[PDB]
Design a binder for this molecule. Structure first.
Ligand code: MG
Ligand code: MG
Ligand code: MG
Ligand code: MG
Ligand code: MG
Ligand code: MG
Ligand code: MG
Ligand code: MG
Ligand code: MG
Ligand code: MG
Ligand code: MG
Ligand code: MG
Ligand code: MG
Ligand code: MG
Lengths: 186, 156, 66, 125, 223, 86, 180
RNA sequence: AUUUCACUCAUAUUAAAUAAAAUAACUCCAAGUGGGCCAUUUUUGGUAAGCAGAACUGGCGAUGAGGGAUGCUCCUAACG
RNA sequence: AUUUUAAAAUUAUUUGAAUUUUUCUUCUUAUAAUUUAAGUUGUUUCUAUACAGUACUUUCUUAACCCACUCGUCUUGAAAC
């Protein structure tokens, strides 16, 4: 015998393949794997990796944050591997160039009315093979509500986690263990 | 039943040494402390206010709080599969400036001038410490009249 | 019938299976309950510094774009 | 033991028979993995039945070849054996069990014209 | 533009000539040291004095026990020395720290001082190399000088005699050369051991001590 | 690349000269001085006795004195202990 | 030349001292003569005795010489006397013995065999003091006096010892032990 | 204290050695367990026990192969 | 389908220098070939001038030599009186 850990076998931890059976997405994965391999640019590698991630790691990005992130990058291209949504809290939109996976109808209409354009990834692969003057962006990955229940258990000292409750009110879990008046707080 | 008090098992730990009783000197009250310093926790039993707990007697930490007569110290402690940071609040008599750091400080100060001189003459300097190694050869002079012969001894 | 009542046999093999973990080494910690009358003054110092910095930056922007 | 004819090597020829199937007739000879404490076959005692493992696997280059040194293809009518006109040196044909004699005569006659061998061209004669 | 191959073809030839010259000077050094030591001792006997020799700086260590039933502190040190199974063998540098590490594991090994010809025989008959990106290494046998120069030619070693030189004497490049080699895997000895239970210095047949210069005879029987 | 047979680096002359570009010269020189000396049976080896007379007489007195001294010291220790035991 | 008859004991001469210090900058020097199987064992015994007798440990000392004394007349027959000290199961004793040989280590080889055969004493429990040579007028043990008469003769009464290929298993006449 | 500007502190031999050191770090969802026993060394009750009760490590259990005639725990050594 | 290449070695003609002074002396400082490089090649015979024979492949049956306690289960522990 011999004294190795994990019998000498190396370990990896992430997702290895697509789960989705959409044929257009499979064509995209083939294309960008080829680009990443034959032009190792650290731009095509990251893209080829990101379009394999599950849904919870491809969050949406709104128009207002898109414009705010590109405020000091005029005449550049923003790249997102999620969806763009409209934002009714914006009053005015600039002229922008954006590539992404999906656009909502309202956001697509608003972008084109201000003089910009929307691109798909097979067009950015054709005009920007190595991602010159392209800026990679992503949306909030820890804003989902499910994340508000994770972490330290609600009942440990100074935990911010939400509990799982039938409903909300003065009659639902607010008496003993939540105020000093009933034997202790938290 | 079982008896686990706060001062249990400290009969010899918390006792003064021979012919060395009495309260502390007056210069102990003139020591300087600053944030981030290394410090030793040594309980002094003749001051009963703000004594540390049994476990921490003899440990070393860093300062995270200074008050009128108190100091907060960050100390590691092993709990069963991990190490936890503990926040220990003690009074000023049970506190001593740590000496575990001084060789590094002297080394830095002294190596500064050697580097400055070597670069001033544009030499090549090596400043890392050297582990004790094998010894070289030498020629040892010895008169024949000085070698004494020995042999095992009989039993008595 | 009686039984065992204590042993910590096999406990540090379990402890070393996932090693002895260590603290996290952050750069800042919270000053919630620490020495007051010193951190309130620090709040004032930092507000003054930020005011000066922002005013200079804003003035530079104002003249640069004209 | 090991059997070798040409370049084809078989690592074992005997079958794996089920433990205790020689002693009780309600136990069939098809292999089942032994589970259960105190088995003496699950624990690899010497002198008893062996277990099958992935080590006895065959060379990838010669895994499905017959002693003919070709692969086998089973056909059901005359039209099914169309693709064999391009690779007539790597494949041999066998006729399905439930085809009549009249259909078999036609299949055999076409296989001869294509220069492909038939494994069982003597049935129902 | 077939000039892309000719400049490389000249570079290889110049590299080969440089290696030849370096090897010849190494041979000179070996003969000179061997002769000087043989004269200093002869002069010491004449002038009523003793000439104590320099001590060794390098040992070769073999493992003697399997992987079952060991205390944890022994397992840690075996891992840090890169000795993982029964009859492995590696070179080790001699310091205060390595001596104390070697005292922990003494009853399970045996070691000694290797000669130049023993080093050469080990490197030519049982010499393997780690090739690849860091942490992906692909054990390969030497067969040529390309792999050596590719990984280690930044410190000016180009070929197998250069690392023989750097191993036999603790040259400036010892950590890299030693770490470049795979751990040696060796046969059992041709006439057996005496008793791995007992020590070399015990008045019985035994094996596990430090056998200073008798290591060469043993590792010629399992090479 | 496909792997091939690993050739014996010591007894296969072509690969031995491939790894060491200096081995041919060293081996040739060794063969030359080997043939010279074996050809000098009954022509040389006759004076090697003369050099024996030259330098063994030089070293003999020193070696003889050294071992004489060691032996005398061991004997003196014996007598010194035997006198004390009485 | 016949390795079936060799013992593996030789004699060595070792010299050593302590590493000089400020309190002692020219320390005493020591020598011994040790019988062992190789030079490494001789050094081990030297440091063992340095520790037991003086206050030297190998870790703060250095070695000056290791010689391996050879013998001058390996075909003349000498008389030897040996002084011992060894441990029994219930105490420790010291002894004097005599041997006849052509080498000192040849006599030490006999001594280890005899002390194992007669007293079950292991090499780990034996300390050797003062091997030397003794004249024939000062021999004490009767079994050595028998061997130094004027005209020593005796018959040979041992049984034959034959090569393995002539050591045949079906004989055709039962052999004789007489051999005159 | 904090903040802003200047100058400068060994690296390719890496501010002491060695290292199939990233086979790392961190989140989520869950199973099965919570009657144990044995050996060297230390050790409590008892005249003692193949008795009862603790400590560090290695094992049996969950594990077969060669040796100890035989043998769950001993020696070598762990399995395509 | 173009690294079984380059290089290295060998042999026979060469262009120059050393030294160890030589039918294996060195330094690819010019062309040709060969393998010791660049993981086995050749010659004879048989099967045989056969179409299933007593030969070859294969499946059963019966010996020898070595080895092999009754499965499932609860249990620290099962071949278990
Ligand atoms: Mg294996
Ligand atoms: Mg089969
Ligand atoms: Mg079981
Ligand atoms: Mg033999
Ligand atoms: Mg043996
Ligand atoms: Mg043992
Ligand atoms: Mg086991
Ligand atoms: Mg027995
Ligand atoms: Mg039998
Ligand atoms: Mg049996
Ligand atoms: Mg169980
Ligand atoms: Mg029971
Ligand atoms: Mg059972
Ligand atoms: Mg019973």
């Amino acid at each position: 015998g011999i004294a190795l850990k994990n019998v000498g076998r190396i370990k990896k931890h992430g997702r290895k393949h697509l789960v989705s059976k959409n044929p257009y997405l499979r064509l995209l994965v083939k294309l960008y794997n080829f680009l990443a391999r034959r032009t190792n640019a650290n731009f095509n590698k990251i893209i080829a990796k990101r379009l394999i991630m599950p849904k919870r790691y491809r969050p949406p990005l709104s128009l207002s944050k898109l414009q705010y992130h590109m405020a000091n990058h005029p005449n550049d291209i923003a790249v997102v591997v999620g969806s763009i949504t409209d934002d009714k809290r914006l009053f005015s939109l600039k002229q922008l160039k954006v590539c992404a996976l999906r656009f909502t109808e309202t956001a697509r209409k608003r972008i084109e009315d201000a003089g910009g354009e929307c691109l798909t990834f097979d067009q950015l692969a054709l005009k920007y093979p190595t991602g010159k003057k392209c800026v990679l962006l992503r949306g909030p990955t820890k804003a989902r509500t499910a994340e508000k229940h994770f972490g330290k258990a609600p009942g440990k000292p100074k935990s911010k986690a939400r509990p799982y409750v039938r409903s909300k009110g003065r009659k639902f879990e607010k008496a003993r263990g939540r105020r000093k008046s009933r034997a202790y707080k938290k | 039943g079982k008896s686990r008090g706060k001062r249990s098992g400290t009969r010899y730990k918390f006792s003064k040494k021979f012919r060395k009783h009495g309260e502390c000197t007056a210069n102990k009250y003139l020591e300087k402390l600053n944030y981030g310093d290394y410090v030793d926790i040594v309980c002094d039993s003749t001051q009963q206010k703000g004594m540390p707990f049994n476990y921490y007697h003899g440990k070393t930490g860093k300062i995270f709080h200074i008050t009128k007569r108190g100091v907060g110290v960050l100390v590691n402690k092993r709990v069963k599969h991990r190490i936890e940071q503990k926040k220990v609040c003690v009074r000023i008599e049970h506190v001593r400036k740590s000496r575990c750091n001084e060789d590094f400080l002297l080394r830095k100060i002294k190596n500064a001038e050697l580097i400055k001189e070597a670069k001033l003459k544009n030499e090549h300097i090596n400043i890392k410490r050297k582990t004790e190694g094998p010894k070289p050869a030498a020629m040892i002079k010895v008169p024949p009249s000085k070698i004494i012969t020995i042999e095992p001894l009989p039993f008595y | 019938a009686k039984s065992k009542n204590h042993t910590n046999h096999n406990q540090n093999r379990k402890a070393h299976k996932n090693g002895i973990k260590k603290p996290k080494k952050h750069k800042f910690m919270s000053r919630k309950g620490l020495d007051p009358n010193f951190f309130r003054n620090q709040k004032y110092c930092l507000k003054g510094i930020q005011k000066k910095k922002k005013e200079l930056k804003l003035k530079a922007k104002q003249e640069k774009n004209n | 033991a090991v059997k070798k004819v040409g370049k084809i090597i078989k690592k074992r020829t005997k079958k794996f028979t089920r433990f205790q199937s020689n002693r009780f007739m309600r136990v069939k000879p098809a292999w089942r993995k032994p589970r259960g404490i105190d088995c003496r076959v699950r624990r690899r005692y010497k002198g008893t039945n062996l277990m099958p493992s992935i080590g006895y696997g065959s060379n990838k280059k010669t895994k499905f070849l017959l002693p003919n040194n070709k692969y086998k293809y089973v056909v059901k009518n005359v039209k099914e054996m169309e693709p064999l006109i391009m690779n007539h040196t790597k494949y041999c044909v066998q006729i399905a069990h439930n085809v009549s004699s009249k259909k078999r005569k036609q299949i055999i006659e076409r296989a001869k014209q294509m220069n492909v061998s038939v494994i069982n061209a003597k049935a129902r004669l | 533009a077939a000039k892309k191959i000719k400049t490389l073809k000249l570079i290889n030839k110049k590299k080969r000539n440089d290696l030849r010259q370096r090897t010849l000077r190494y041979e000179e050094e070996y003969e000179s040291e061997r002769k000087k030591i043989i004269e200093l001792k002869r002069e010491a006997r004449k002038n009523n004095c003793f000439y104590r020799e320099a001590e060794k700086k390098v040992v070769f260590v073999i493992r003697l026990k399997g992987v079952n039933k060991l205390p944890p502190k022994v397992r840690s040190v075996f891992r840090l020395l890169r000795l993982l199974q029964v009859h492995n063998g590696v070179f080790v540098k001699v310091n205060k720290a390595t001596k104390e590490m070697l005292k922990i594991v003494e009853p399970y090994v045996t070691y000694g001082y290797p000669t130049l010809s023993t080093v050469r025989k080990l490197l030519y008959k049982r010499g393997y190399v780690r090739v690849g990106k860091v942490r992906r290494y692909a054990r390969k046998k030497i067969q040529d000088n390309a792999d050596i120069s590719k990984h280690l030619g930044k410190y000016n070693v180009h070929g197998i005699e250069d690392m023989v030189y750097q191993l036999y004497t603790c040259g400036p490049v010892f950590k890299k050369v030693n770490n470049f080699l795979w751990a040696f895997k060796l046969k059992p000895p041709r006439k057996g051991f005496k008793a791995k239970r007992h020590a070399f210095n015990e008045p019985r047949p035994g094996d596990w001590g430090n056998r200073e210069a008798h290591i060469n005879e043993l590792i010629n029987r399992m090479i | 690349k496909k792997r091939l047979q690993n050739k014996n680096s010591l007894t296969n002359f072509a690969v031995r000269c491939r790894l060491n570009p200096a081995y041919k010269l060293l081996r040739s020189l060794a063969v030359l001085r080997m043939r010279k000396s074996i050809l000098e049976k009954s022509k040389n080896k006759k004076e090697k006795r003369v050099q024996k007379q030259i330098q063994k007489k030089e070293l003999q007195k020193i070696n003889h004195d050294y071992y004489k001294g060691v032996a005398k010291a061991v004997k003196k220790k014996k007598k010194r202990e035997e006198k004390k035991a009485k | 030349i016949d390795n079936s008859l060799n013992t593996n004991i030789h004699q060595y001469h070792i010299v050593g001292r302590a590493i000089p210090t400020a309190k002692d900058k020219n320390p005493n020097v020591y020598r011994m003569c040790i019988f062992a199987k190789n030079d490494t064992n001789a050094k081990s015994r030297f440091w063992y005795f340095m520790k037991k007798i003086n206050k030297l440990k190998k870790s703060n000392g250095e070695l000056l010489a290791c010689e391996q004394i050879k013998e001058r007349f390996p075909l003349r027959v000498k008389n030897y006397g040996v002084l011992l000290r060894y441990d029994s199961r219930t105490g420790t004793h010291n002894m004097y013995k005599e041997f006849r040989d052509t080498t000192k280590e040849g006599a030490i080889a006999q001594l280890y065999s005899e002390m194992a055969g007669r007293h079950r004493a292991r090499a780990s429990s034996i300390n050797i003091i003062r091997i030397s040579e003794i004249s024939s007028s000062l021999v004490r043990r009767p079994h050595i006096k028998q061997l130094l008469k004027r005209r020593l003769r005796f018959p040979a009464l041992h049984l034959p010892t034959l090569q393995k290929e002539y050591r045949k298993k079906f004989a055709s006449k039962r052999p004789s032990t007489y051999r005159m």
